[PDB]
Symmetry: C5
Subunit: 114 residues, 5 copies
């Protein structure tokens, strides 16, 4: 597997606008909400769950990176894999998207699989 697999999806020129940390079924997790830097479109929501999904190994790196980009408010590219979380109340509150990568998009092009 790779963040850049064509079976994953991404959204460019986004800003991380909200951050949540919690626990589910023994696993700490976090979710983020992103919106278009320019105010258009519909929010993207994605979550990472410790020790859950094939993306578990990157949980801490992604949590730290989401925090960094959340604090700067800079434009970024969000990489997700759809339809991963199945807990229905969790999905209704957040989404089924697993967060699988984060890329800066500084005044050029987003620096990630494209």
């Amino acid at each position: 597997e790779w963040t850049g697999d064509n079976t994953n999806a991404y959204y460019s020129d986004e800003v991380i606008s909200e951050l949540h940390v919690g626990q589910i079924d023994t696993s700490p997790y976090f979710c983020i909400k992103t919106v278009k830097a320019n105010g258009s479109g519909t929010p993207v929501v994605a979550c990472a769950v410790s020790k859950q999904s094939i993306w578990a190994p990157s949980f801490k790196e992604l949590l730290d990176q989401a925090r960094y980009f959340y604090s700067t408010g800079q434009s970024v590219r969000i990489h997700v894999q759809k339809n991963i979380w199945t807990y229905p109340l969790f999905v209704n509150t957040f989404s089924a998207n697993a967060l699988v990568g984060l890329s800066s998009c500084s005044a050029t092009q987003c620096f990630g699989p494209k």
Copy 2:
């Protein structure tokens, strides 16, 4: 279990006003006090204990996130489970509330379960 279970409690539009770190029964722990961003109402006190309660797996994530929101002063929703801690002097000093989640809040929304 889940942060968002309706058997937990939450308080929206709060700011983390105080922070404490210590140790109990060989466990590092921390506590936070939150108040409404507008100053109304009664403070909420909640703690996390690294090796105790079903919420122990999220100790480090919650500590880091509480430290972050404390440093920014921004509005949050705090999620707790009531009636968890049992050492009477500890409960007298802080509360029986276990901290189980933290969500950032906009002016109109909080990004977490409700």
Copy 3:
């Protein structure tokens, strides 16, 4: 044991004024000096030593918390257990106090045991 045991000592409305990191007898350690926010009294010195004393598990959390409170200069309550470190040259340079807790302070109270 507990930070809040009445056999420990604490000092309210202190500012962390100095910070030192070193190694002793295979153990990284840190020491802080604190002085009353209003100028009265005598400095307090306390240290935490990795993998040494009953307070060992808290070493990392306390070091991180002391760094933060040191960086802000805010008024804190420092909790110690006296007469723990016995290395006489160490003691003479620093103190025999083990650091066992740190609490933020408001105008009227500090957020921790008393």
Copy 4:
């Protein structure tokens, strides 16, 4: 092996201009892009992969250091070993350069091997 081995390459007076975090083959990884502080020349891209290459032990230290230099915008020397990554879609998105070191730069000389 050593960051400073003469079989590695380095580029002085660079500014980290992009940062990317993801996962590949069960391993967290990050990539950075740097450009000459004066705008001449062409960008340098290098990546670290937490579980891969002889440089894996330094993954966390390099990621932490990269994030700090990225946040300051200061001029740095980036040290790489060429021709390490082999997955073609990864190489063509980023490069085959393994990141092996990062040095601050004085106004006249960078603090590291040359």
Copy 5:
């Protein structure tokens, strides 16, 4: 062993002016350069190597504390043990000094062994 032993050396009223991270012999390492806050004297160079020397247990604490004082720019006392590193290319790039302690300095004194 102790940071404060007779056989170690120290330099007061310094500022950490440069920082380098790398890897050698499978071990992450870092080096710092310090200069007198008042511009006088000769710079001090010292390194820490994760799996090497009797000071290896303090690697991460010294890294974090070096990074802290580097970002604040405040004046410090740097403690070293001389003639530790032996690989000639490394010593000639950096120094044979092992970093063994860091102490905050006020205008009149430093908070550490002397």
